[PDB]
């Protein structure tokens, strides 16, 4: 599964081209989409334009008819697979206006994590790095397995392990471990707090 970002130009118009790769006939529930100035909050709900597929190379094309100041920003080609459950993060490229305009895209942005010389787009909360971003390729993101979690925009190759609430310490799961939140421990049915380690009970007696 591959992701690319190219920007072709013809007279007044400027085309942005997200290119996606997937197994033929496993694209039902597949979405490619583009985002302007999304700090890793990029989704179909927050996209400029999207293409939900139905059934091996797929393409999304967003054309800017005129060069204007308000179209200046930071764009990102992203894809989401329903069957695989995999996200896909393309490189952060920028439009900048001055009169004139230029396209572009070691002090990596908040949404990126460094990999050798290059920077790479971070994966979503509850999403682990399956594959590092290539020079041309984008960041691939698997969802966390059950019993694990990641609670931030991350470049982690493995999900954090969910905390077990020890019954023998009179504890139970106040909040259950979601793939984006760790579990939290409160006191068992008919137990009270002895000491606290933070804003949570360390151990409980009945």
């Amino acid at each position: 599964i591959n992701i690319t970002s190219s920007a072709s130009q013809e007279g007044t118009r400027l085309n942005l081209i997200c290119t996606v790769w997937h197994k033929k006939e496993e694209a039902e529930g597949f979405v490619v989409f583009l985002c302007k100035d999304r700090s890793g909050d990029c989704s179909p709900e927050t996209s400029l334009k999207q293409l939900r597929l139905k059934r091996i190379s797929s393409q999304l094309m967003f054309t800017i008819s005129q060069v204007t100041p308000l179209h200046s920003g930071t764009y990102q080609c992203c894809a989401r697979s329903q069957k695989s459950g995999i996200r896909l993060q393309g490189h952060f490229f920028s439009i900048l206006f001055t009169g004139n305009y230029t396209v572009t895209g070691p002090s990596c942005k908040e949404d990126e994590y460094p990999v050798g010389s290059e920077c790479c787009p971070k994966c979503s909360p509850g999403y682990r790095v399956k594959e590092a971003c290539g020079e041309l390729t984008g960041t691939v993101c698997e969802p966390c397995p059950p019993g694990t979690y990641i609670a931030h925009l991350n470049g982690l190759s493995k999900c954090l392990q969910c905390q077990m609430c020890d019954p023998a310490m009179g504890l139970r799961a106040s909040r259950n471990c979601s793939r984006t939140e760790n579990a939290v421990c409160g006191c068992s049915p008919g137990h009270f707090c002895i000491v606290q380690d933070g804003d949570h009970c360390a151990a409980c007696r009945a």
Partner: peptide, 20 residues
């Protein structure tokens, strides 16, 4: 606190918090 924690922690650009 009689309970005393001694640990080894990962810092990384791949996560904003420290990792136990």
């Amino acid at each position: 606190a009689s309970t005393i924690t001694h640990g080894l922690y990962k810092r990384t650009p791949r996560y904003p918090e420290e990792l136990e």
